[PDB]
Amino acid sequence: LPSWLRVGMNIAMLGMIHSDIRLITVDYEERRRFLKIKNYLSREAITEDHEDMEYLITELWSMCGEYFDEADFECIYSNHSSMELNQINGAVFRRKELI
Amino acid sequence: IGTKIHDGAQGKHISGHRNYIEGKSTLNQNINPQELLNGIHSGAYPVISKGARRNPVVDFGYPIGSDGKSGLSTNFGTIHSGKNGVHIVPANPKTIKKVQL
């Protein structure tokens, strides 16, 4: 992951990480100038998750939009093992979980 | 673009506000976000671009805040309109000034 994206996500995630977030990943498509953000939750998604992701993208683009023009997100209920989530590419946030 | 500032969302970006989150981009202390928003609707402040998620970007023409990543002053704000109202996020000037061919 490019440093600008880890910086931007570090700041944007301030104040929106709650205990049911297992993993947040970002996929950066440089030629398309597009970002895909995935929020892996330990519960079904709620409307506040979508609001929080919209807030996050607004902040991230305001800081880092020289690098990307569009972004999409997904909120995913995952019951996969801690080992599996530990190995997904693009993690900018990963909760501590027992192996 | 909505007509009412959502204070709870806007306050994340106002130092000393009850909702402020230290580290985020901040509006300057003398900046009234509702006055900026009223000036967008009155035509004082033009929408010059759109950012991700189709957010309008406005050039206010004078400093309105500073970017949390660069620390730099900016004249530009990203306009976020939701069901509970609007908030303005100071935009890194490079977001506007570094333009692809």
Residue numbers in the entry:
A (entry chain A): 5 to 103
B (entry chain B): 323 to 423
Paper's wording?
The Maf polymorphic toxin system is involved in conflict between strains found in pathogenic Neisseria species such as Neisseria meningitidis and Neisseria gonorrhoeae. In the MGIs, the MafB and MafI encode toxin and immunity proteins, respectively. Since MafB contains a specific domain (MafB-CT) in the C-terminal region that has toxic activity, a gene encoding an immunity protein, MafI, is necessary to protect MafB-producing cells from the toxic activity. MafB2MGI-2B16B6 is a polymorphic toxin present in MGI-2 in N. meningitidis strain B16B6 and it has been shown that MafB2-CTMGI-2B16B6 has toxic activity.
In order to infer the enzymatic properties contributing the toxic activity of MafB2MGI-2B16B6, which is the second MafB protein encoded in maf genomic island 2 (MGI-2) from N. meningitidis B16B6, the X-ray crystal structure of the complex between the toxin domain of MafB2MGI-2B16B6, hereafter referred to as NmMafB2-CT, and the corresponding immunity protein, MafI2MGI-2B16B6, hereafter referred to as NmMafI2, was determined at 1.5 Å resolution with 18.0% Rwork and 20.8% Rfree using a single anomalous dispersion method. However, the N-terminal 53 residues from Ala270 to Ser322 of NmMafB2-CT were invisible probably due to the degradation of NmMafB2-CT during crystallization. The overall structure of NmMafB2-CT2 has a kidney-like shape characterized by an RNase A fold and consists of two central β-sheets with three peripheral α-helices. The structure of NmMafI2 consists of a four-stranded central β-sheet, one strand (β4′) of which is relatively short, and three helices. In the structure of the NmMafB2-CT2/NmMafI2 complex, the α2′ helix flanked by α1′ of NmMafI2 packs tightly against the shallow groove of NmMafB2-CT2. The interaction between NmMafB2-CT2 and NmMafI2 is mediated by extensive hydrophobic and hydrogen bond interactions including eight salt bridges. Notably, the residues in α2′ of NmMafI2 contributes approximately 65% of the hydrogen bond and salt bridge interactions. Upon complex formation, approximately 1110 Å2 of the binding interface becomes buried, which corresponds to approximately 17.0% and 17.5% of the surface areas of NmMafB2-CT2 and NmMafI2, respectively. All negatively charged residues of NmMafI2 in the complex interface contribute to salt-bridge interactions with NmMafB2-CT2, except that Glu74 of NmMafI2 forms hydrogen bonds with NmMafB2-CT2. These results indicate that complementary charge interactions are the main driving force for the formation of the complex between NmMafB2-CT2 and NmMafI2, and that NmMafI2 functions as an inhibitory regulator protein by blocking RNA from accessing the enzymatic cleavage site because it binds the substrate binding site of NmMafB2-CT2. The dissociation constant of the NmMafB2-CT2/NmMafI2 complex was measured to be ~ 40 nM.
